[PDB]
Amino acid sequence: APSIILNHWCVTWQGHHFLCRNLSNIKILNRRNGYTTLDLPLTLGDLTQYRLAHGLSENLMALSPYSWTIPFLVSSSETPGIELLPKVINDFGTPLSLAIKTNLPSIPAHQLLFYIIFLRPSPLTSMSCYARPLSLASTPSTNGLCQSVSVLDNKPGLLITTPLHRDPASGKYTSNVQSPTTFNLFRVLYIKLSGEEGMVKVKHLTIDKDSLQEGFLQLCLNMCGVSYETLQCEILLELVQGPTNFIFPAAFPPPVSLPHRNCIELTCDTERCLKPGDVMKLKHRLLYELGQTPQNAFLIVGAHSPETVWISPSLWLPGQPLYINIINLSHKPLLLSRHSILALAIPISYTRTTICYSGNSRVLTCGAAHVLEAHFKHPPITSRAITDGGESPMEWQTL
Amino acid sequence: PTGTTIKFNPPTGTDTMVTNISTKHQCITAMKEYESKSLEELRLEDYQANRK
Amino acid sequence: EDNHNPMKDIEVTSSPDDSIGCLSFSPPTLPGNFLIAGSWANDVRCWEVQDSGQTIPKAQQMHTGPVLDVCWSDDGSKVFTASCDKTAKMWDLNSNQAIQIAQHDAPVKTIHWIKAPNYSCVMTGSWDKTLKFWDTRSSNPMMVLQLPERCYCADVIYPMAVVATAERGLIVYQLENQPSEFRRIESPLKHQHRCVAIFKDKQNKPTGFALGSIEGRVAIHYINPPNPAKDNFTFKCHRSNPQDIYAVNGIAFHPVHGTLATVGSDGRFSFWDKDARTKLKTSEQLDQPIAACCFNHNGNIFAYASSYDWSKGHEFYNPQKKNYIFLRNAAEELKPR
Ligand SMILES: [Hg+2]
Ligand SMILES: [Hg+2]
Ligand SMILES: [Hg+2]
Ligand SMILES: [Hg+2]
Ligand SMILES: [Hg+2]
Ligand SMILES: [Hg+2]
Ligand SMILES: [Hg+2]
Ligand SMILES: [Hg+2]
Ligand SMILES: [Hg+2]
Ligand SMILES: [Hg+2]
Ligand SMILES: [Hg+2]
Ligand SMILES: [Hg+2]
Ligand code: NA
């Protein structure tokens, strides 16, 4: 009902997602690698706050069930002859941009449909890191403090506080501590680092236990450009009883651009360059296995940014390398600035490329796999369209 | 005489606008017959007279 | 053409059968939002308001007379109620039990909760020309102040208090150690007083008030302005575009943006910027007066009640006309430009 008709488009709210439609003929120009790009005159913040009012909340993403979802631009199933690179919209200030693959010289008015759906990933409780056994001998002087503690909803946790010393060979920050409680799986609730400059940035973290059941834990942290000799560390862990769906060998940081959503921001490990119209099957270091029935995996999709990195979508399978398929569609070369977002790994469940979504059917398909309808299933919120027509002066007097 | 037994008639006046206009005051307590009572006072005594 | 809800705003379910006199949103100490309404059918009702826009009737208490004001305790466990039955009540929401806490010699028109460092009381203003303060346990008031006339409108933001009476009486009160008179102000409006709302400066400190009369005019008044002859002003509102002049029934400031809403006998609400001295919005015309309005603790919600206000006497009262409370998302429109 609440639409936004502005500059050849009209963002309407069905109740759980947005549907977008061109209002005039779109001429395909400067087609590269089969795709053309096209800017819209609307941002995610215009749709969720500035041009629509969703329920009685200040932002659609402030709603109980929308405060946990990933906004996801996805093509429509009723657009034959038109494909769209799907992408997460993980900022609100950048105008929406499309990547259209079509053979048509032009797209008629009202035929370029696409959605912005709200993806609720697999919960954090289905994923946890794994501590592998090794041959670890106790250090002659113990290095840190390990206190059992309760975390989350009265669950068994572990507060480790310790200095991390830089290995001269690897550059990794390590420490050996004696855990009072034994555990096989764990989740990382936070890492607070304190160097010479103060608060410090983390790439990955592993924890190894010893194979003599002694309770000795080896902490290893890979850092971003931190050159310091000693880091002061505080690490809260959740101890995970019994297997989860995904088992990782190393922990990764929470997503910076989607706080409190369960997904992995994939950054460029090695700096590389891309010529216009060129692809790259970049290989990421991340790996995972299954701990346990519908099937589970990760969607690998692009993100949104002023200079979009376009990502041809893929499904990331247990035990398989993580390839991130980049597709240069810009007129300039693209060098992959380190520590910046290349793709997102979103955990979903499905039943058995070209990611399309049907509005009537409540059906979202990645290739042949069928995403579980529950994931993009939210309650209908009655929102209104904000106009802000006129601000005339008071006609005012004084004594 | 309590309540609002006298018929309502909007008082006439004049104001300036931003130009010169005449006004009608659509509030019963602007009439001289009622100008010492508030709307809620008038309504309560109409209610106590079952004058609904 | 049906003009009951021209803006097509959320409509609260189980609305008061009679005209709605007053509206009050729960304080920020409760999680979520609860709306209280008093009506001329003697009752006080509570609805929970979700962020989705849905409303769930919670509970209801009754006076033996029309309910003219309502408000909450700071902590959100009590609702206080002021009635034409010359009494006020404290409604304990956990227990759904109401008890008398105040006795007046005429209808109680205003009720307010004062949380001070050294004392907590409820302040009642009455047509018996007193301002009284109850400690919610004793039958004897902690304090009684004599007003210049009958209490019409009243507003409290600790430590300030504004009271308007009949015959354009206007007194500002100091509340810091004990409630006490601070200033009687010669009225900036030439007509009957109907509503009043204190506003804060940038420090979140009370610095003045907006006053509304029956004559389509609102006054903006600072207590300590740098330049009174220029900084205190009035403005016209709730008029047609011969001009019809209507009464301003309610004023409310957005708790965060400091902009304000006015509602009037003309059936319209308007949004303003007392600083830019501009008008932000005027609604479409509802088919009956808007009697009361209210913002929630953060200003995401604007509540406004559509009810006859007796502005044309009893001849224009249609008791089969239904009353509504409308909820409207205010987060974006009340922000200044
Ligand atoms: Hg549309
Ligand atoms: Hg993990
Ligand atoms: Hg330890
Ligand atoms: Hg490591
Ligand atoms: Hg890189
Ligand atoms: Hg598809
Ligand atoms: Hg599909
Ligand atoms: Hg797929
Ligand atoms: Hg309640
Ligand atoms: Hg109050
Ligand atoms: Hg008091
Ligand atoms: Hg209020
Ligand atoms: Na090395």
Curated annotation (Swiss-Prot), chain C:
The keyword Secreted does not apply. The modification Phosphothreonine is found at T207. GO terms for molecular function: RNA binding. WD repeats lie at residues 15-57, 62-92, 103-135, 146-184, 193-233, 243-273, 282-318. InterPro entries: G-protein_beta_WD-40_rep, WD40/YVTN_repeat-like_dom_sf, WD40_repeat_CS, WD40_repeat_dom_sf, WD40_rpt. It comes from the Eukaryota. Keywords: Cell cycle, Cell division, Cytoplasm, Cytoskeleton, Mitosis, Nucleus, Phosphoprotein, Repeat, Transport, WD repeat. One of its GO terms (biological process) is regulation of mitotic spindle organization. GO terms for cellular component: cytoplasm; fibrillar center; mitotic spindle pole; nuclear envelope; nuclear pore; nucleoplasm. It is found in: Cytoplasm; Nucleus; Cytoplasm, Cytoskeleton, Spindle pole. Disulfide bonds: none annotated. It holds the Pfam family WD40. Plays a role in mitotic bipolar spindle formation. Binds mRNA. May function in nucleocytoplasmic transport and in directly or indirectly attaching cytoplasmic mRNPs to the cytoskeleton. Interacts with NUMA1 (via N-terminal end of the coiled-coil domain); this interaction promotes spindle formation in mitosis. Interacts with NUP98. Interacts with MYCBP2. Interacts with USP11. Belongs to the WD repeat rae1 family. PANTHER family: MRNA EXPORT FACTOR AND BUB3. This is mRNA export factor. It comes from Mus musculus (Mouse). The gene is Rae1.
